[PDB]
């Protein structure tokens, strides 16, 4: 259970986001159904009145919390990957428009998975804005906590992979568009009941053998980390 505060780019606190950049559900529940319209942007899908201005080579991050700003960030139960896509927001969200600039799940050095690390990182990931079209585009990131995750929602809808997905309204305003952007994913319909990552036992299976799901991380993409890059104590 964990929602976006708001982003900081190039390291500076751009504000509280919650409904005003930040398509922000009412609370920090989870989406368990992947067929879905709650998967696009969770399940108050709608223009909020601001949209971040960015240039490419930026850094974009994400901050997240549980109850309050900078608190324990989501239960440490919670184990699982992290991704942030991509869309222009002329799509809503819909049809094969999501690129994935971003893909963390388990680092055997540390033992640590994604969320293990957000927590550590007072609830931060960022990308890089990539080499785009200049426009209105929708970041959305994805927190899959795999604690329920041996069975499928489909089958059980009392357990399943829990997804905590947050849209960005974001306006990439100086870019060369070299990089344009490729065919997408949509969302739902990405991930199925098959789709490696979605059904895992993190109690039985090695973490080193978890797969994440498709698709992979776009090559156009710069992206990006889990770390800290502001003190929001300091405000
Ligand atoms: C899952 O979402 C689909 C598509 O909206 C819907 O038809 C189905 O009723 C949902 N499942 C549950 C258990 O609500
Ligand atoms: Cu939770």
Redesign the pocket.
Known sequence: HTLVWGVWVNGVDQGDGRNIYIRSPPNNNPVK?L???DMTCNVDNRVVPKSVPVNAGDTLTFEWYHNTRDDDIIASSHHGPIAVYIAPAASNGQGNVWVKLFEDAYNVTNSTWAVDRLITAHGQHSVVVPHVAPGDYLFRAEIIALHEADSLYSQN?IRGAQFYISCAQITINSSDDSTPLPAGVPFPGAYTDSTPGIQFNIYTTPATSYVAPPPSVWSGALGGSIAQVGDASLE
Do not use: F, L, R
């Open positions: 159904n067929t879905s319209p809808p």
